[PDB]
Amino acid sequence: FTPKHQKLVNQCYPTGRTTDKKPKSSETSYLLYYVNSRRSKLEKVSTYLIKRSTSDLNHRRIGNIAVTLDLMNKIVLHCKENLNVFVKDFLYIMNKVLSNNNFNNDVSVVELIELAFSSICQNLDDVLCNGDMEFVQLYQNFVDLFFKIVTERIHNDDMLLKCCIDISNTNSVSSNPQLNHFVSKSVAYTISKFQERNPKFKTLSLEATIGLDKAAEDHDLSVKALQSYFNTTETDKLNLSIRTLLRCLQSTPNKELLEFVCNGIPVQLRYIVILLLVRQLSDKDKNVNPIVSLKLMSSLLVSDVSIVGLSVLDIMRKLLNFQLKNATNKEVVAQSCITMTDLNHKTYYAEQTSDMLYELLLKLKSDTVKDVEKNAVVEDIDFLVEHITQPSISLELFIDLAHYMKNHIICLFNIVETEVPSSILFSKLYSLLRELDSHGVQKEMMEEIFDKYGKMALLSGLNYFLENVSEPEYTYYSYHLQAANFLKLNDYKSQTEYKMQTRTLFTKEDLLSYYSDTGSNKYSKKGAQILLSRD
Template sequence: MFLSKHQKLILQCYPPGKGIEKKPNSSELSYLLYYASTRRVKLEKVIKFLYKKTVGDANRNKFGNLEVTLIIVSSLIEKCTDNLNVFADEALSIMNLCLKNNDLSLAKTVLNTYGTLCKNLNSDLFVGDKEFVKNFSNFSNKLFDFGTNNSKTPSPNQLEWKMISLISCRYISHCISYDSELCRRFLSRAIPLLIETYHEYQPNDKEISHIRTNSAVNGDEEAIKLTKVSSAKTAIAHQKADEDFENDIVDKQDVHEETVSCLKAYFNTSLISQISEATMQVVKYNYNHPKSGIDWSNKFLQLCTSWIPVQLRFVVLTTLVGNLKNLSSDKSQIDYQKHVAKFVLGLVSSNVNMIGLSISDFIQNILDLQHYLYTKQFDSLSSDNLNELSNIYSNAIVKLSTHIYYFDQVPDSINEIFIKIDSTLQSEDSSPSANLFKFISTLLNDVSGIFQDLRNKPSSINRNHVGLHHWEISLPLIAQKKLTNLYKKLSQEEVDSIQSKYLELFEFFLDYELEDDNEDINEIKGSENIKSNSSINASASSLKGDPIDKDNLLNANYDNLITNQNNFISNYLVFLDKYLTNNESINFQITEKLLIISRLLIDKFGINFLSNFTPFYFHWQLQNIDGPSKDTVLRDTFNDTCLKNILDSLDSQYPELSEHMSKCPLVDKLSYNIDYKISNGIWSTELSPIEKLNRDSNINIIEKKDFQEFVSGHKLLSTWVNVDKPLVLSVVPDDLSKELASELPHVNGNGTSNGYSNGISNGHHESNGSINGDHLTENSSKGIEDYKPTLGLGNTADIISIHSGLRNTSNGIHHSNTINSINNNLGVGPNSSYNTTNSWTEYNGSVYTDNKSKHLKVSELKEMLSDHNLKPPTIGDNQVTPGSVLSKQMVTHDMGSILDDLDSGDDESIIV
């Protein structure tokens, strides 16, 4: 009679009697929920009265009433979600009171109410109500401990108590993302329990089957079907576990399935911070509890990773690598560093796909860790620890590089390793030379491991192969000792070891990896050529497909190996020269390997190699046969052997040349010369064991006219081989390569030659290995078809000379010594003191130097003319650079008119 309306409505929900399992009267409960949801103040009155009643019922052990109260609270949470902040704290207090009596049935009802609360919480409560966050965290820990502590006591309901802890872990996964501190603290408690439970209750090899059915590698249809079947079975198993829990008939299989569900709840999220924290908790637990073993631990992390959305799985790997970076600077954490590194290796060695992982970034990070290991961390490591860590890093690089995600992955990986090698070669690192030697050797072994792994375990996914151009940055490895910063610190034996390993690796590449991926293919034949997951297939349709027949490598100007001066073969010959020329410590075994490499390049690229080799033949040619040094004989033998290999191969490579080769005087002349050198002891028979013919022979040095006659005898050779091609003794930058293209045959859009351009018409002459202009030979145009002379600005030295003259001309007075001084500084004039061994960046034949002189553009010449309104004076013969167009009869001497005719396109292509 004296109760308020809300109190009457609440009390009417409680059925009479003292039974333990009671449920609220449904119709009264419905009316109460309607009443509480109409106004906020009514909801406040309802929850306060419920709390007061709970206190009394808990003190009197009225478990039936407590269950009814919990069901009412759960119903209010679902009905009044928008006003949850009004009664969330009281709801927690009511659940807390219900746990006092340690009753299993009541604890299950508390768990259900807790689950309803977790599902309906939102970020507003965690951001705006710090008191609630504290109370929620405390109750969550209490509920977790409540089940855990009771499960440790042997009893008939031991598994049910264990399930309460596990299910509470699953429920809280809905809201720990709202508060980072709560996430960190609860994961540190939950993950160890879940791992321990999983390990204790797992069926035999259960985690392996989970990984297999959750990976679905490479888009395999059968694997996808198995995954769907497994998902359906998992859902049924989880439903059974819930039913068994309600009916108090929980078995070990139910516990295992609930553990899996909890782990999925923590890892199957889009929250990166949660994935990272959960990952590190897994790693830490397995480090502190090594009884499970590293193999089992690795499989367990792979299982957890397979539950993460595929586009976010890379977070696990980046988290581990980031942790390794922090550990590498802590001397006391060596064992833990190795432990984390093993997880990285295990993950990249697995078949768990990580779409979105930046392969290049990962490899860069591992290479940095490996470099730090040898240069900074080595003093705190034993030899065994250093080798173990280094091997783990290397294996990780190899395994990830050969787990194909995209077409250019392998070339990208190889490129990153070569970049690291190059930076180490050129650095002024003060680390012990023995460590740097080991580091370079390790990186070369990494490349070898990638190639071996690809060959032994070919992937069903199509990929692009490593090309010649990917090796260009590694070519400094074959330079002689005195030309490389790192080599200067190493012993000759260490340098020889690196070079030998590098050449063996390159030989393996030429034999097994090199293929023609140069042609674009617009369509891939789906499942016939590529097996991948849907994400890879979606991006593959516009990329390259099947490798092209290797015979295409023999095509003239393949991949611009002739028309582009900055090509691999040219650069290879440049660094070959840096090894063979003036090398006081030349090694026979290294030279022999270089000859093998050269033979392979000849066999694979034919006329492309010949075109680039021609200027080097005369540069390496033995000029004085009286008492040559051992290294000179070795180089000359190398030189003649390469030419013989070329001539012997051309007729089989290009059937149209067979008759030309049989009648070619150059072949006989080379053969007689080799006979003479063998007979007179100026031939290295160990390097090139050519059988001597019993005939009288005299030395008759091959000259350019012999080459010109050979080339002019057939259209294929005359089109693509320029006997007067400039000798370049350094790697040409891409911007300068355009200018040097004018020295080569001009190729139109159809791929056919329009004859020689500036290389002949401008009168360029190159010496036989002499930079000062000795032994100059006249150009012969015999047999050259479609010859079209052109007029250009000349070579680099010309433009620099013109610009210098303009800058030093004042009031019509020209400083006569300017051009001579410029030429001498460039190393191209008659008084030049150029030395090919001093710098990799100097060029022979008046081509290029990167000595601190400014690189000039045609636009600057135009600007000089417009500013000063001057015409450069006529330059005398004694001031002209060898090979300059200024020495020839020109149509006009008005430089201003020439510059005026140049448009922006010329300005872009004629630069120095």
């Protein structure tokens, strides 16, 4: 007695004892039809494949096993929408084959095995991923055996790369606890085998077409694996992939590798990398060099790699805070002093630069912070302004900041492009200008202030310095000098020189004599106005 399924399945096999057996065409077609018709047939046919392939394992016939694996592949592909019926069976058989040292040798067997595995992984439902435990152990066993065999008996790293791609193509493995580690070990292996070929990325370059998007033209399999694990919108997979990347990057620090893999990662959410890098500082591991991660952040932020939608403020605040907690090191303070500005390298929005500086100012104003935080922030603003190429300051911020570092105010002033300031802001500016260490700084400051706002500085300076100054100071005389220089008046300059070399002050009348004729001074009317309209 031979039931139909048994006869069909057996009818798919050739007669001999050869090892290059390919399943007979028409018979396997009709078999596929038969199992695809009613799902009751898949049960029978799959179970029968288990028993039969067991007998073929015993009598040690490779051909029948090859045909078997081929059939299994074709069935998986044909009966996808019912895959959860027979997957555990096929996996049991594949593991049983792999567990057999008489079938491990043959390369074709392992090839067909991997093929069946790829066709499986590509069509899985999360149903067994989460519900069934036996399936989890069969999958686990398969991956373990496959690595343990290909590494030792097949000696074909390409097989392992294909397996990594299979795991990557499996549904929600990165979202599964029991099967999580396989993603990590896969990424680790493809990385280490991508640093094996192209050993350039094994270099210790950490300070100073390349893209992966253009490297996917096809070719090396390692790159295909990288694209498989990094070029993805699946957040979990990318989480684990990046984490493993950073981990394998602590051992072989390479900025170009990071650049490459980032070129692989979808442009949209690359910010996540940075986040993890930042988190890498907060980590308690102690086998992680924070300096390495900082330099890697820097290397990333400087280059062409677009990092859309970065929470610049948040990241900066985190870096700064980390620098304040550990502030007694040249490395923790300087590499942060560098990365912090390296992050401003690109302008995500106009308010950012100001905001950055502002975040520091607020920390400086409070007396809660320790001396070394003061010093560190000072050096930070120092570096920032040293790297701020073009103007972006609200004059008030320039004032609050000016109070704290009188050495680098000039530079800060070159960043203020407020075309029109308030009349009070002027008096503030002057009032702080009076409180300055050197007269050189006061001189050049007065000069540039006049340069930017000739009319407004003339008038506001006139009023202010007339009212407030009651004793010979440098700022007073420098104002009158710059005013005379702006009005191109020899008598004004001469008199100022007198009042300066004799420590005397100007009176309302003396200054009135310069704002007398509109043909001699364009601004005579407003000047005289504010000169006599007060007291």
